[PDB]
Design a protein around this ligand. Structure first.
Ligand code: PXC
Ligand code: PXC
Lengths: 352, 352
């Protein structure tokens, strides 16, 4: 048993101090008894002592991104030896859309915690809406699946999804294939159309192209006017005006937000409500578990508030440690309202 | 709370008192405080009284298939109120066949009972192999996914899958889009490869066409001789010598079995291990919960043992009640293990 060690971390985690939390988990991960086999096996390859010289969140700047590894590393070793017997491990992959695919492990406690964080703020808000959720997103080996199912149960209906293979979509628009992308996009909208038109759907998770498509279908729009309380847009292909126009002129009773995948850190980040009065899309991460740095593409250097840079993300929780993953997007750096740790993002945009 | 009603139904199953079990569930499903809104309402369209006029399994012949009907029915109404608060309804579909589809509801406790029935005989027996599962099958809204996930957690390793979008294969297939069925399969095969190579998996779930393009790869085949222990093949494209050959010749000691989805009975029947003895693939179902009848296409009369007929599957449990689904496959009918209600099936093929 180590569950009272573990509480201490989750405790430190919100009495807002980076510091103590970082050290506590640096200990969790590298100390002999409790650590991952993987990190324990990695300690001797580091040129610094993860205990002695490593105090601030920022102080993790000294690990490099170990994703190369996770393609080969047999998943059983990723699992912190000090988690309970019934922790309930699970493998998720990170888009083997070419350069193919990186293995990771997550846990129910973890996803539960992610979600309570996303949803605080409206979980308990009087007259908050209720109903099923249609999530038009990957499930299968993709950890968004499992994160979305979890939200859907807390909103009082059932979680519904579609058949979607993002890996073929990709390997085909990259592969240059025009007709396919249209035909498969079709088949996606058709699936979403059916469920919206045959079960009462209160909550839709989808993406601008797909929404954009549904809005072009007279019967569906009408139906959306009747039943959607809130839509989440995922991707980075987001045009703020378009959304303002939808929100005010078409689905005026439906709120909007955006979601940002950071598969690398075993989670997703959430936007504020995007309204007509909104002037950028703004994101927060589940800090300190997940934290963003935003850095210059030339000099690896955290850039100033207000400027564009490259998203660097870091997961540090009792379940998993992933320092300092370069994500493949740029964002405006903004002071992160609480702590105490990690940055806000605004207006995420793709790379080169 | 109704733990004692469920207990009785379970216990009448576990000692095969088929009439008790059926009579109990008619009460359970048809009565104002325990049953699903759907059945309660559906009663006013029947012309017999489930509670009084139904005494044995055959007696359900009085019911008609109520499937084409679960496209628009509200999912929440499928849920028997007699189930507990905590029972975790989750929503699954089938019949993305042409474009439909039919929503149903499943529960952890059912999924669990099912798997337990699938897995006795081996679960415990000495020396039973054990490790990771790779399941080349759909997740998303396909109960099949959920099913295997369960199984994999009981074989001491984790659950790997792949993106795979069976409606696409299907539509394409029956478009004549012959071009990209073959492209797509390559994609599935590739994704399988990867995991086969990068994580050691003990058990694979797939299908004859894919395993076919798969054994065209010499180094996957070496990995396979090395790591696989058990292979479950589903779909109904089962070619028998083709397997017996594969198992005898190509990879000579992985064991091989078949699996058959009756998705609108919320479950999968299992075959007897295909030995090199095997003269027909034979499936057991999870009786009395799931029971099969095999019926002549003109008279709906139950065929003699050994004639091939059109298959009818029925699901009756404390979780759901789907009487008499016209599935879309023929089989040779066999005696089921006497004591148990329902036929054994052999050498299933599809319709025309
Ligand atoms: O999911 C998000 O990223 C998200 C972001 C911002 C506000 C949100 N408000 C929600 C409400 C509500 O405000 O009643 C109900 C259900 C889901 C909601 N999701 C929200
Ligand atoms: O999965 C199936 O459909 C199946 C059917 C028949 C025999 C099976 N035997 C298995 C064994 C074993 O016999 O040791 C181990 C792991 C999985 C097994 N799966 C089997």
């Amino acid at each position: 048993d180590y569950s009272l060690e573990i509480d201490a971390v989750m405790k430190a985690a919100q009495i807002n101090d980076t510091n103590n939390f970082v050290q506590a988990l640096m200990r969790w991960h590298f100390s002999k008894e409790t650590g991952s086999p993987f990190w324990l096996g990695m300690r001797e390859q580091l040129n610094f002592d993860p205990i002695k010289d490593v105090k601030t969140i920022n102080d993790l700047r000294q690990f490099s991104d170990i994703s190369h590894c996770l393609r080969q590393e047999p998943v059983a070793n990723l699992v912190p030896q000090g988690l309970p017997a019934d922790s309930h491990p699970q493998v998720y992959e990170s888009g083997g859309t070419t350069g193919a695919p990186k293995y990771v492990v997550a846990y129910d406690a973890w996803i539960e915690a992610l979600i309570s964080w996303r949803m605080s703020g409206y979980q308990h808000r009087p007259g908050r809406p209720s109903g099923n959720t249609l999530a038009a997103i990957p499930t299968g080996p993709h950890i968004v699946g499992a994160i979305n199912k979890e939200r859907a149960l807390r909103l009082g209906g059932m979680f519904f999804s579609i058949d979607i293979d993002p890996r073929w979509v990709k390997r085909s628009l990259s592969e240059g294939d025009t007709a396919t992308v249209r035909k498969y996009t079709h088949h996606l909208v058709d699936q979403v159309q059916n469920t919206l038109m045959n079960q009462d759907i209160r909550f839709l998770v989808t993406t601008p192209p797909v929404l954009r498509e549904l809005l072009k279908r007279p019967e569906v729009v009408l139906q959306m006017k009747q039943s959607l309380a809130q839509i989440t847009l995922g991707g980075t292909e987001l045009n703020l005006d378009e959304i303002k126009f939808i929100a005010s002129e078409i689905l005026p009773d439906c709120e909007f937000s955006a979601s940002y995948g950071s598969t690398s850190a075993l989670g997703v980040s959430r936007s504020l409500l995007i309204t007509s009065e909104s002037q950028q899309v703004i994101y927060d991460s589940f800090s300190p578990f997940i934290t963003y740095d935003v850095v210059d593409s030339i000099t690896a250097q955290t850039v100033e508030y207000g400027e564009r840079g490259n998203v660097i993300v870091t997961h540090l929780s009792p379940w998993a440690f992933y320092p300092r993953v370069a994500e493949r997007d740029t964002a405006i750096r903004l002071p992160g309202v609480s702590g105490f740790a990690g940055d806000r993002l605004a207006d995420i945009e793709p790379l080169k």
